């Protein structure tokens, strides 16, 4: 999930790793000890917030989604350029 409430909880980690709730702190502590993730969570109730990570193998749905979000960003920057520059060039030049 690249966007749409990146914030998560330990229930998916413990459910996918069939581990108890007492070992998830050592699990994320080892995850931060390896150095592949820099995630620091300011949570009060148990939550899992993550940061920069590298796939390093492949992702085709992220290639197509990369084209979708990339084209969306490009047409939004183009829309703002034509919008601001449209009347801005006519009134200021």
């Amino acid at each position: 999930r690249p966007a749409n409430h990146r914030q998560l909880t330990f229930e998916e980690i413990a459910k996918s790793a069939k581990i108890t709730v007492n070992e998830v702190e050592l699990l994320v502590m080892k995850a931060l000890s390896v150095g592949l993730v820099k995630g620091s969570i300011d949570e009060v109730d148990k939550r899992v917030h993550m940061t920069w990570v590298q796939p390093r193998v492949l992702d085709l749905q992220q290639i197509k989604g990369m084209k979708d979000r990339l084209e969306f960003w490009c047409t939004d920057v183009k829309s703002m350029e034509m919008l601001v520059e449209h009347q801005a060039h006519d009134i200021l030049t």
Partner: protein, 286 residues
């Protein structure tokens, strides 16, 4: 080794001379010029340069023609008149990087020290910076491919030290200086979206083309860092930055009070002289 380079416009105007002394023959190929500079300091500073007759073949790309006697004679006389500058590398005017450039650059890798490569455009229609410093160093690849010559992009800047700024400013008489204020700021704030629009739009089309229609590995490993950094800004909800909008908008309020109050101070002399001058000139006119 080298973090940044400095390229003076004199060598690019010498490329304008490369496009001037052609003679209307119909070749206009990638004429290779002998780039000169100061490799002593960590930063590279190009002062001037010269050229060497360079001709390739139509079909075979591996054909390249250089000269050692002309290089040692022009470099010998140039060193005799100015010994503060020595050979550093070369540069070609072709917009495309051919395979033969490893053999062309390899000669100045053997005889000369590590040469930097600069790719420019034959037509000054590109809005981007025409100069790109490409260092000729061999890098180890993680996929296991054999070690080969790799052209890493080194940042470059176009600056003049003492006289070329004066000569360019006198020859142009159209360009403007920094001139902080309304016009120089609003022009950048208007055309900047096109300055990024032509670059990104010009790049992601051939990029997306080479995604599906690509082979001959293009170093797909760096694409993971590409999309990674692109996904390092996952549409922040702006919740924490609201107070920052209150700070920048409070500075906006400060500019409001400064504009209204200061302009209200400027209205004094106008809104006084408009009366005391008109009524006295009128009552004393006749």
């Amino acid at each position: 080794a080298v973090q940044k380079v400095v390229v003076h416009p004199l060598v690019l105007l010498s490329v304008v001379d490369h496009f001037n002394r052609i003679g209307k023959v119909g070749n206009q190929k990638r004429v290779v010029g002998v780039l000169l500079g100061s490799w002593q300091k960590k930063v590279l500073d190009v002062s001037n340069s010269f050229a060497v007759p360079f001709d390739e073949d139509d079909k075979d790309d591996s054909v390249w023609f250089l000269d050692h006697d002309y290089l040692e004679n022009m470099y010998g006389m140039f060193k005799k008149v100015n010994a503060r500058e020595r050979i550093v590398g070369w540069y070609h005017t072709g917009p495309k990087l051919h395979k033969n450039d490893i053999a062309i650059n390899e000669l100045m890798k053997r005889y000369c020290p590590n040469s930097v490569l600069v790719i420019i455009d034959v037509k000054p229609k590109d809005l981007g910076l025409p100069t790109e410093a490409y260092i000729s160093v061999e890098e180890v690849h993680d996929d296991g491919t054999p070690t080969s010559k790799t052209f890493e992009h080194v940042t470059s800047e176009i600056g003049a030290e003492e006289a070329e700024e004066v000569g360019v400013e006198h020859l142009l008489r159209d360009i403007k200086d920094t001139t902080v204020g309304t016009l120089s700021q609003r022009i950048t704030n208007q055309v900047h979206g096109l300055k990024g629009l032509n670059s990104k739009l010009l790049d992601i089309r051939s990029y997306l083309e080479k995604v599906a229609t690509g082979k001959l590995p293009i170093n797909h490993q760096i694409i993971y860092q590409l999309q990674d950094v692109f996904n390092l800004l996952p549409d922040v909800s702006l919740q924490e930055f609201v107070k920052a909008f209150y700070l920048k908008t409070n500075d906006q309020m400060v500019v409001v009070y400064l504009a209204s109050l200061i302009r209200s101070v400027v209205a004094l002399h106008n809104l006084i002289n408009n009366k005391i001058a008109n009524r006295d000139a009128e009552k004393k006119e006749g």
